[PDB]
Write a protein that binds this DNA or RNA. Structure first.
Ligand code: 1FZ
Ligand code: MG
Ligand code: NA
Ligand code: NA
Length: 327
DNA sequence: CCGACGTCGCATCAGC
DNA sequence: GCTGATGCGA
DNA sequence: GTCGG
């Protein structure tokens, strides 16, 4: 209901989560802290003790103790300590560069590379993805206003149709959900000559065209069905430049399109809650298909899908439009 | 006591 | 050269 | 770290 009811606590758990993933390299702890952060931020009361919070599904003893220390002292001792730790905080920060995960960050800090400057002084030791992530460190953390998302959509749909009028391109993500701003642009791509049953360079032709009109500027990774890169809007004649933005383009078989749209429309936390319920109801869902689970709990053949609501029907959930799919 | 905790595509690395 | 494992991001 | 077999 409101971030400031227990925001001091949720910040704490979120901070603790990051250090688990990035420094301890313990992903399941990281999730446990965020799972607890989620359920507490939805708690419509100001928490007065660890024991009270422990009633919430996801909060156990160890987190309850920490809330007590926080409520009493207004801080965490393990957190004040790890914040000032040069090794730990450097590793944690370095992972904010796209391409640098917990492993690489630990490897960089170990040979003394602790900052963005140290990184820029050492371009040789970075791979392609990491260099680009370093180059656009600031831009990749900026949000994209909906107005710009719309202009970027204009260029995408236009140039996609120019390569082949039978391409189907849909911008998904938070944009499709109607958010006033997005973190990146998610593009789903579809062509009549590409299905599960079965032209060579369908994804490439779209990418290179977007490169030619000088929209796509860099490539993080590119395979046959999935592209990851950087793009930028053209600025007014003498006006200043737009930030470089992240854009993913994904070629999905046309007969699996709606499972793709649903999956990449999100939201991430919604898309998770859905498939979790689906599994509890006898189905399994991924980016391509929805398959019924057997009596020994094994998946069968992919069911037919001709709309997003079909997948909703299968798992006994009433339809939610993209704008209502945040959680 | 201790195992589960989501999954996909691509770059890169370990190893034959 | 090749297959398979691991790191990574969404 | 938490839940649950
Ligand atoms: C972050 C994330 C995303 N995904 C998938 C499912 C999401 O529905 C889909 C969208 O990803 P996104 O771009 O991180 N989510 P968004 O576009 O809704 O929010 P934003 O404005 O781009 O940050 O990517 C995962 O499967 N695991 C993840 O950890
Ligand atoms: Mg997105
Ligand atoms: Na509990
Ligand atoms: Na990163």
């Amino acid at each position: 209901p409101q971030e400031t009811l227990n925001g001091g606590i949720t910040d704490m758990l979120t901070e603790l989560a990051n250090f688990e993933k990035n420094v301890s390299q313990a992903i399941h702890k990281y999730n446990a802290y965020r799972k607890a952060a989620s359920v507490i931020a939805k708690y419509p009361h100001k928490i007065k003790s660890g024991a009270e919070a422990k009633k919430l599904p996801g909060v156990g003893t160890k987190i309850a103790e920490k809330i007590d220390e926080f409520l009493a002292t207004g801080k965490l001792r393990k957190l004040e300590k790890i914040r000032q730790d040069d090794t730990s905080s450097s590793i944690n920060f370095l992972t904010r560069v796209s391409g640098i995960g917990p492993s690489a960050a630990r490897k960089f800090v170990d040979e003394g590379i602790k900052t963005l400057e140290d990184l820029r002084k050492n371009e040789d030791k970075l791979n392609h993805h990491q260099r680009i992530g370093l180059k656009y460190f600031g831009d990749f953390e900026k949000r994209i206003p909906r107005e710009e998302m719309l202009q970027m959509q204009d260029i995408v749909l236009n140039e996609v149709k120019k390569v082949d009028s039978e391409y189907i391109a849909t911008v998904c993500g938070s944009f499709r959900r109607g958010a006033e701003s997005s973190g990146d642009m998610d593009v789903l791509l579809t062509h009549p000559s590409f299905t599960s049953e079965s032209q060579p360079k369908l994804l490439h032709q779209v990418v290179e065209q977007l490169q030619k009109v000088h929209f796509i500027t860099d490539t993080l990774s590119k395979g046959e069905t999935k592209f990851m890169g950087v793009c930028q809007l053209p600025s007014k004649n003498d006006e200043k430049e737009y930030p470089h933005r992240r854009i993913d383009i994904r070629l999905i078989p046309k007969d699996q399109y709606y499972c793709g749209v649903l999956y990449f429309t999100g939201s991430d936390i919604f898309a998770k809650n859905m498939r979790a319920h689906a599994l509890e109801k006898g189905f399994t869902i991924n980016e391509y298909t929805i398959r019924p689970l057997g009596v020994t709990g094994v998946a069968g053949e992919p069911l037919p899908v001709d709309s997003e609501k079909d997948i909703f029907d299968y798992i006994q959930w009433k339809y939610r439009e993209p704008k209502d799919r945040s959680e």
